[PDB]
Amino acid sequence: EFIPHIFYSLHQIRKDPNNLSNQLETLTGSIRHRLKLCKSLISENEDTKDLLPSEWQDIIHQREQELQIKRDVLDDLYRKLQR
């Protein structure tokens, strides 16, 4: 997890700038660490980057048209074979 850690470190930055430069540098390094691991984790996984809008509707339309043509041909087969 990097999201809550980024949030929290962000907030103690914005709450206490009066901390000595040591804490500021260390904490900024920590955020750079978290976003470095963030970009790495984005990098190795293609699926997330794909996740990271009409195509779904087109797939639904093709699925429903193939379903209805299957239903129609099965109805025709049922009607014909009963003789």
Binding site: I3, R32, L35
Partner: protein
């Protein structure tokens, strides 16, 4: 090769990209010990946009259900094929 083209097509990829850019600007600012407000506010609004897109990704499951009904489609096709 087309994989990266598809990944660049979805908005949240650009979102992580300029979020990284904004933190790069912020770390450059703190390195110069000259914190510029606009960089930090840009960072926070970009983070918020990231998080709204994080919700927007979740409602995922529709594609998965389409995937299972697709497998149902081809298995029914194979069954009727051997018939």
């Amino acid at each position: 090769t087309n994989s990266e083209d598809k990944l660049s097509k979805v908005q949240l990829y650009e979102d992580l990209c300029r979020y990284e850019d904004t933190l790069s600007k912020l770390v450059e600012s703190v390195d110069r010990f000259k914190p510029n407000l606009d960089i930090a506010k840009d960072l926070i609004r970009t983070d918020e946009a990231l998080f709204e897109n994080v919700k927007l990704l979740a409602e995922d499951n529709i594609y998965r259900n389409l995937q299972k009904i697709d497998k149902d489609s081809e298995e029914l096709d194979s069954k009727t094929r051997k018939i």
